[PDB]
């Protein structure tokens with residue numbers, strides 16, 4: 583589950599049945615170094 | 616209106632009816648920080 587596979591819209595307070603997990607950002611390891 | 620929503624092809628000298636605006640790049644605030 584990455585940012586190029588999913589898209590952001592709204593918040594977790596609207597979707598019925600949303601699970602809490604993590605989404606990997608490919609920009610973070612490139613910018614940390 | 617961002618780069619992840621629009622694609623670049625040609626320039627503003629060809630397409631009729633193009634207007635000037637600013638496009639927000641999400642990479643820039645992350646790179647500056």
Ligand SMILES: *[C@@H]1O[C@H](CO)[C@@H](O)[C@H](O)[C@H]1NC(C)=O
Pocket residue numbers: 600601602
């Ligand atoms: C994560 O999702 C669960 C699912 O309902 C929620 O209860 C919780 O408040 C969310 N946030 C957390 C665990 O920080």
